[PDB]
Amino acid sequence: AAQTNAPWGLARISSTSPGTSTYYYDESAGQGSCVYVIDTGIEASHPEFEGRAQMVKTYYYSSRDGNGHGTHCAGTVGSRTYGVAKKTQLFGVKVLDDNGSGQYSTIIAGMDFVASDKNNRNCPKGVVASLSLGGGYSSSVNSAAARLQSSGVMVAVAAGNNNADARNYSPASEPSVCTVGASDRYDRRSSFSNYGSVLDIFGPGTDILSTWIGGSTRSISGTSMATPHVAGLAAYLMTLGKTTAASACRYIADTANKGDLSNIPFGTVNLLAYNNYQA
Ligand SMILES: Fc1ccc(C2=NNC3=NCCN3C2)cc1F
């Protein structure tokens, strides 16, 4: 399948070169997979989700996304126009309030919620979780992410936006999950992206168009935007049977575009997520 005039990041993940605008992908499109978006919620009524999104849990007075961040991330995972895996099922877990903040205890509870809740969902091709959030180092937060991964969920987490080594942030610093840095449309490391040995992969993160609340769209930047590209890619590859939740991060790194990013610090991987789709 070819989507013309796609957002640059979708085109980038199906290309050996920057500077193109068509996204190419296998029509299976993540059908039969599920992606949890652990964030501020998802506006499931957005036409771009086509009925494939739903809120499954909130820790606040509403499950609605009163912020936009979670809706934007969910759109990059799986919206019809802005998403990597255009036929995946999207499940929202609202651990962040409408200002984008949340207590670590609530985030940990949300991760353990997903590890159990997947057993209440039909995801025969596999389960992914996208965590576009983070803070300072916490062994407890890292352990929660490691439990979620161990339970059979491909966990992708944002590296953070501090232009610093991600070893001092959680869940970015947890070794067993997939820690995602951000790049721009010219294959430069995004100016804010964290780096370091704990990164596994880069994805598009600067100027990413996706869904927003009120049935709208907008372009924003962050490692929060790169993370759902990798989450959606994992769902897409698991549906194709190319990898599993336990091995998908390693598979994405093994099949990535290598050595093509600029301003990558010595000791950080130079690997850009790539679907290796041959139309
Ligand atoms: F490696 C690079 C090569 C070209 C550019 C460019 N800056 N801005 C720009 N506007 C239209 C085309 N174009 C190329 C950036 C890079 F980082």
The closest residue, in CA terms, to atom 4 on ligand 1 is 186
- The angle subtended at Cα 175 by Cα 67 and Cα 244, nearest 5°, is 80
Find out whether 133 and 102 touch, Cβ atoms under 8 Å.
Answer: yes
Can you list the domains of the chain with their CATH numbers? 2-272 (3.40.50.200)
Ligand 1 centre from 186 Cα, in Å?
Answer: 6
206, 207, 193, 209: which is closest to 270 by C-alpha? 193
The C-alpha atoms of residue 87 and residue 202 are separated, in whole angstroms, by 23
Neighbour count for residue 266 (Cβ, 10 Å): 5
8 Å CB contact between 134 and 225: no
Q: Can you read off the two tokens belonging to residue 241?
A: 């049977």
**Parallel/antiparallel/unpaired status of strands 153-158 and 178-183:** parallel
Q: Which atom of ligand 1 is nearest to the CA of 19?
A: 12
Resolution in A: 1.4
**Does the annotation count 69 as an active-site position?**
yes
Residue where the block lists tokens 């057993």: 119
Establish whether 228 is an annotated binding residue: no
Q: Look at the chain and count its residues.
A: 279
Is the link from the previous residue into 171 a cis peptide, with omega within 30 of 0? yes
Solved how? X-ray
Q: Is 177 annotated as a binding residue?
A: yes
Q: Which of 39, 65, 97, 184 is the catalytic position?
A: 39
- Using alpha carbons, select from 169, 89, 180 the residue that is nearest to residue 131: 180
